[PDB]
Enzyme design. Structure first.
Site, PDB file in Angstrom:
ATOM      1  N   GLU A  17       0.667  -1.218   0.034  1.00 32.39           N
ATOM      2  CA  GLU A  17       0.057  -0.047  -0.030  1.00 32.39           C
ATOM      3  C   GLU A  17       0.878   1.192   0.052  1.00 32.39           C
ATOM      4  OE1 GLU A  17      -3.181   0.914   0.364  1.00 32.39           O
ATOM      5  OE2 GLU A  17      -4.036  -1.108   0.576  1.00 32.39           O
ATOM      6  N   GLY A  18       0.697   1.952  -1.024  1.00 32.00           N
ATOM      7  CA  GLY A  18       1.525   3.441  -1.140  1.00 32.00           C
ATOM      8  C   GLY A  18       0.764   4.516  -0.864  1.00 32.00           C
ATOM      9  N   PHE A  20       0.284   7.050  -2.927  1.00 24.57           N
ATOM     10  CA  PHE A  20      -0.552   7.402  -4.198  1.00 24.57           C
ATOM     11  C   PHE A  20      -0.984   6.102  -5.184  1.00 24.57           C
ATOM     12  CE2 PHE A  20       2.379  11.107  -3.399  1.00 24.57           C
ATOM     13  CZ  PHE A  20       1.124  12.008  -2.950  1.00 24.57           C
ATOM     14  N   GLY A  21      -0.612   4.694  -4.598  1.00 29.49           N
ATOM     15  CA  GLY A  21      -0.937   3.588  -5.458  1.00 29.49           C
ATOM     16  C   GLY A  21      -0.903   2.388  -4.589  1.00 29.49           C
ATOM     17  N   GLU A  22      -0.524   1.193  -5.324  1.00 25.42           N
ATOM     18  CA  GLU A  22      -0.699  -0.102  -4.823  1.00 25.42           C
ATOM     19  C   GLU A  22       0.209  -0.954  -5.401  1.00 25.42           C
ATOM     20  OE1 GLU A  22      -4.645  -1.490  -3.997  1.00 25.42           O
ATOM     21  OE2 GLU A  22      -5.344   0.137  -3.043  1.00 25.42           O
ATOM     22  N   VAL A  23       0.773  -1.976  -4.843  1.00 26.52           N
ATOM     23  CA  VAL A  23       1.405  -3.052  -5.526  1.00 26.52           C
ATOM     24  C   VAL A  23       0.505  -4.322  -5.637  1.00 26.52           C
ATOM     25  CG1 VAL A  23       3.654  -4.417  -6.030  1.00 26.52           C
ATOM     26  CG2 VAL A  23       3.695  -1.968  -5.282  1.00 26.52           C
ATOM     27  N   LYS A  51       2.942  -2.497 -10.019  1.00 25.96           N
ATOM     28  CA  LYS A  51       2.717  -1.172  -9.355  1.00 25.96           C
ATOM     29  C   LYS A  51       1.898  -0.271 -10.154  1.00 25.96           C
ATOM     30  CE  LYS A  51       5.594   2.790  -7.556  1.00 25.96           C
ATOM     31  NZ  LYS A  51       6.755   3.050  -7.214  1.00 25.96           N
ATOM     32  N   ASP A 147      19.393   5.155  -2.305  1.00 25.93           N
ATOM     33  CA  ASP A 147      18.710   4.542  -0.961  1.00 25.93           C
ATOM     34  C   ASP A 147      19.050   2.990  -1.080  1.00 25.93           C
ATOM     35  OD1 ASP A 147      17.411   4.260   1.514  1.00 25.93           O
ATOM     36  OD2 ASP A 147      15.225   4.243   0.337  1.00 25.93           O
ATOM     37  N   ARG A 151      16.353  -3.605   2.829  1.00 25.31           N
ATOM     38  CA  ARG A 151      15.134  -3.410   2.754  1.00 25.31           C
ATOM     39  C   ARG A 151      14.625  -3.153   1.356  1.00 25.31           C
ATOM     40  NH1 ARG A 151      16.988   0.964   5.319  1.00 25.31           N
ATOM     41  NH2 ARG A 151      17.285   2.986   3.956  1.00 25.31           N
ATOM     42  N   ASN A 152      15.606  -2.501   0.443  1.00 24.93           N
ATOM     43  CA  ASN A 152      15.219  -2.321  -0.936  1.00 24.93           C
ATOM     44  C   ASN A 152      15.717  -3.385  -1.660  1.00 24.93           C
ATOM     45  OD1 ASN A 152      13.490   0.156  -0.678  1.00 24.93           O
ATOM     46  ND2 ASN A 152      15.231   1.275  -0.495  1.00 24.93           N
ATOM     47  N   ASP A 165      13.072  -0.149  -5.314  1.00 19.79           N
ATOM     48  CA  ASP A 165      13.371   1.127  -4.503  1.00 19.79           C
ATOM     49  C   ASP A 165      11.796   1.213  -3.928  1.00 19.79           C
ATOM     50  OD1 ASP A 165      13.506   3.416  -3.245  1.00 19.79           O
ATOM     51  OD2 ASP A 165      14.404   4.478  -4.942  1.00 19.79           O
TER      52      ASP A 165
END
Ligand SMILES: O=C(CN1C(=O)C2(CCN(C(=O)c3ccc4[nH]ncc4n3)CC2)c2c(Br)cccc21)NCC(F)(F)F
Ligand SMILES: [Cl-]
Ligand SMILES: [Cl-]
Ligand SMILES: [Cl-]
Ligand SMILES: [Cl-]
Length: 289
Positions: A17-18, A20-23, A51, A147, A151-152, A165
């Site tokens: 959950e982002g 401005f969007g979702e994956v 994405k 970055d 975690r990335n 990223d």
């Protein structure tokens, strides 16, 4: 140069959950019709990660997504996220990539201990070598990640790694970012001193973050870099690198890390950006070892 057929993307579950969007995790219906570099095992589900930009996201969010499509369209390496296709001629805008079934490397590795779920030392080096190989590729493109951290990174089958990223907003990693009102959000514990003091991000600062990422791997992702120091102390340490009076401090040698490999890390943390090794050498060192 044509859109992937959006109607063939069958939702399975939400991966993220982002703002401005979702994956989404999707299956591709009838994929043999499209092979779009799809790697289909006949009669098995072709899983992809998608994405997606919310259609009602702000104009600024859409602008940033379109720039991300432009960046992602260049990336063609086995150890970097690769686009299988896009859906951008209509909404919602989407970018499609291979599904990596073991999620992010930090959560994956922290479940393991060094073999006496275990992982061997050679396998840790293989993980790190793949990251170095991906970064080597980005360096050939003159692309600065900014970055790099476990975690990335994503994990697939057989400890295959791809650099991604996720951005800086996931709650799980909020403690890895330093927030000040009106400033960019910053992964200070991974940042070279010149990134902290001058905002100068380069391939050489990516090498520094690679050193920290390698440290994480050799810590089995069970410790935060400089974890006993405050954010203020980490920023102060950047100043000590600049001042160059012998008071700067480094991440300690992990138990799983031999001294020779630790010396490679220390080279990644050289004060002078130009003295840090190139990714081509880092990869060679790790792939031989
Ligand atoms: O890779 C990027 C940016 N980017 C991502 O980070 C993601 C993949 C990871 N992600 C996830 O939510 C997630 C979680 C579990 C997962 N399992 N399998 C896949 C997968 N994805 C965030 C979105 C992505 C997609 Br999708 C499409 C296009 C780009 C990206 N940039 C390249 C460079 F800068 F790093 F070099
Ligand atoms: Cl979609
Ligand atoms: Cl590839
Ligand atoms: Cl361990
Ligand atoms: Cl193993």
């Amino acid at each position: 140069r044509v859109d992937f057929p959006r109607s063939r993307l069958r939702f399975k579950e939400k991966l993220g959950e982002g703002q401005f969007g979702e994956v989404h995790l999707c299956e591709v219906d009838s994929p043999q019709d499209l092979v779009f570099p799809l790697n289909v095992r006949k009669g098995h589900p072709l899983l992809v990660a998608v994405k997606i930009l919310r259609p009602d996201a702000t104009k600024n969010a859409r602008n940033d997504f379109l720039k991300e499509v432009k960046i992602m369209s260049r990336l063609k390496d086995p150890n970097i996220i690769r686009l299988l296709g896009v859906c951008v001629q209509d909404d919602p805008l989407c970018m499609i990539t291979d599904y990596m079934e073991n999620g992010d490397l930090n959560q994956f590795l922290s479940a393991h201990q060094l073999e006496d779920p275990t992982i061997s030392y050679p396998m840790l080096l293989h993980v790190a070598a793949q990251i170095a190989s991906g970064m080597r590729y980005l360096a050939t493109l003159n692309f600065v990640h900014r970055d790099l951290a476990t975690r990335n990174c994503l994990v697939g089958e057989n400890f295959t790694i791809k650099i991604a990223d996720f951005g800086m907003s996931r709650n799980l990693y909020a403690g890895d970012y330093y927030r000040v009102q009106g400033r960019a959000v910053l992964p200070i514990r991974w940042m070279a001193w010149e990134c902290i003091l001058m905002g100068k991000f380069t391939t050489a600062s990516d090498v520094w973050a690679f050193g920290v990422t390698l440290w994480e791997v050799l810590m089995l992702c069970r410790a935060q870099p400089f974890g006993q120091l405050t954010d203020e102390q980490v920023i102060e340490n950047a100043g000590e690198f600049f001042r160059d009076q012998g008071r700067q401090v480094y991440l300690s040698r992990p138990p799983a890390c031999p001294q020779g490999l630790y010396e490679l890390m220390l080279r990644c943390w050289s004060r002078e950006s130009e003295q840090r090794p190139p990714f081509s050498q880092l990869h060679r060192f790790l792939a031989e070892d």
